[PDB]
């Protein structure tokens, strides 16, 4: 939206991945809700409560349809592993937590106000005509007054955001939480992904109600729950890799100090001082999306440009 300038390539890639795992969640939830059953057949010949496995005639189990449904429910609830039953719900919960960690920067009001103000002033500077005029380096008097006003807003916003570092701390915290969560998901999922099996033997001791002790069930949506899980795992890995890169981007450069050395050398105004803390991190994110926004906003931050605009308005 209007906040896309603060969303780098890794952020939008994580958003796309989380959308795909949400699709996984909704698909698995629909499958589990509608067509997840467990057809269990009694083992007629059992050796020590283990299926012996010893024209042809069909085997008569003498069980009603309702007894079969009871056996299916009991061996689905007591012997099928919890991962196979609750994989889509866990996927949905993890996807929701990932989205919440992505948007906790987006919704938390203390940093949200700073983001709104920064985006508003960046968009005003992008559409300001005197910004283009200074980038090109005779004006409207009201336009010059508004330009001096936006200069004052830049200075007061600097004083507003340079005093604190909650924005950078928040972003680092959500990155760390996402990395830790991805590690946990990968570990427990690679542990339990082999528990999703087609043929499951169940021993539930309902011989008083059905007449049989051990049964063999075949879970229908097992293999399709298998590959999905595996493919789900793949997406998570990519997510983690992206997150790990962000963690590397946390420590490769100190985001609390973002220098203007490249900007002032290429431009005529070789006087600008560096920014710090939340302003520095936000300008780093701006450079991640497009350095042109930061270079254009640089002409509204310098004092030589302030003197030039004062002299121009004296002429204007």
Ligand X SMILES: CCCCCCCC/C=C\CCCCCCCC(=O)OC[C@H](COP(=O)(O)OCCN)OC(=O)CCCCCCC/C=C\CCCCCCCC
Report residue 127 as tokens: 């559409």
Q: How far is the CB of 127 from ligand X (least distance, A)?
A: 43
Single residue of 174, 267, 277, 305 touching another protein by CB under 8 A? 174
Single residue of 10, 13, 27, 249 touching ligand X by CB under 6 A? 27
Cα separation, 7 vs 285, whole angstroms:
7
Single residue of 119, 121, 218, 244 touching a second copy by CB under 8 A? 218
63 near another protein (CB under 8 A):
yes
7 near a second copy (CB under 8 A):
yes
Single residue of 1, 33, 48, 53 touching another protein by CB under 8 A? 53
Closest CA to 137 of 296, 20, 270, 267: 267
Which span (166-174, 218-226, 241-249, 301-309) binds a second copy, by CB under 8 A? 218-226
Cα separation, 107 vs 100, whole angstroms:
9
Cα separation, 192 vs 134, whole angstroms:
61
The length of the chain in residues reads 316
User: Within a 10 A sphere around the Cβ of 35, how many other Cβ atoms?
Assistant: 10
Cα separation, 84 vs 96, whole angstroms:
20
Q: What are phi and psi of 83, to 5 degrees?
A: -65, -45
Cα separation, 278 vs 282, whole angstroms:
6
Contact string 206-235 vs another protein (x = CB under 8 A) = xxxxxxxxxxxxxxx--x------------
User: Within a 10 A sphere around the Cβ of 137, how many other Cβ atoms?
Assistant: 10
292 near ligand X (CB under 6 A):
no
Closest CA to 190 of 148, 131, 140, 234: 234
Single residue of 48, 58, 109, 252 touching another protein by CB under 8 A? 58
Which span (50-58, 73-81, 86-94, 105-113) binds another protein, by CB under 8 A? 50-58
Cα separation, 183 vs 258, whole angstroms:
31
Under the phi-then-psi rule, with left for phi > 0, alpha for psi from -120 to 50, and beta for the rest, what region is 273? beta
Which does residue 90 touch among a second copy, ligand X, another protein, none (CB within 5 to 8 A, set by kind)? ligand X
Cα separation, 128 vs 262, whole angstroms:
23
Which span (68-76, 167-175, 176-184, 233-241) binds a second copy, by CB under 8 A? 68-76
Which does residue 81 touch among a second copy, another protein, ligand X, none (CB within 5 to 8 A, set by kind)? ligand X
Site for ligand X in 76-135 (CB under 6 A): 80-82, 86, 89-90, 92-93
230 near a second copy (CB under 8 A):
no
Residues that bind another protein (CB under 8 A): 30-31, 34-35, 39-41, 43-45, 51-61, 63, 65, 68, 171, 174, 177-178, 181, 185, 192-193, 195-198, 200-204, 206-220, 223, 290
Residues that bind ligand X (CB under 6 A): 27, 80-82, 86, 89-90, 92-93, 227-228, 231
């Amino acid at each position: 939206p209007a906040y896309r300038i603060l969303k780098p390539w890794w952020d939008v890639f994580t958003d796309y991945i989380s959308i795909v795992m949400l699709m996984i969640a909704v698909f698995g939830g629909t499958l589990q809700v509608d067509q997840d059953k467990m057809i269990c057949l009694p083992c007629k010949w059992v050796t020590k409560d283990s299926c012996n496995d010893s024209g042809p005639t069909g085997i008569k189990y003498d069980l009603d349809r309702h007894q079969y449904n009871y056996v299916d429910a009991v061996c689905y609830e007591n012997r099928l592993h919890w991962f196979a039953k609750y994989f889509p719900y866990l996927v949905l919960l993890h996807t929701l937590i990932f989205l919440a960690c992505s948007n906790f920067w987006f919704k938390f009001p203390r940093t949200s106000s700073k983001l709104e103000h920064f985006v508003s002033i960046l968009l005003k500077c992008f559409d300001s005509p005197w910004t283009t005029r200074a980038l090109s380096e005779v004006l409207d008097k009201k336009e010059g007054e508004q330009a001096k006003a936006l200069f004052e807003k830049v200075k007061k916003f600097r004083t507003h955001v340079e005093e604190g570092d909650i924005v950078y701390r928040l972003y680092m915290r959500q990155t760390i939480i996402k990395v830790i969560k991805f590690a946990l998901i990968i570990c427990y999922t690679v542990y339990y992904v082999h528990n999703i099996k087609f043929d499951v033997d169940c021993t539930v001791d309902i011989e008083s109600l059905t007449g049989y002790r051990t049964y063999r069930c075949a879970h229908p949506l097992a293999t399709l729950f298998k590959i999905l899980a595996s493919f789900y795992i793949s997406l998570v890995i990519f997510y983690g890799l992206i997150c790990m890169y962000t963690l590397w981007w946390m420590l490769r450069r100190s985001l609390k100090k973002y220098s203007f050395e490249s900007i002032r050398e290429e431009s005529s105004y070789s006087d600008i001082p560096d920014v710090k803390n939340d302003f520095a991190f936000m300008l780093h994110l701006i450079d991640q999306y497009d350095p042109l926004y930061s270079k254009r906003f640089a002409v509204f931050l310098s004092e030589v440009s302030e003197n030039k605009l004062r002299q121009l308005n004296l002429n204007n």
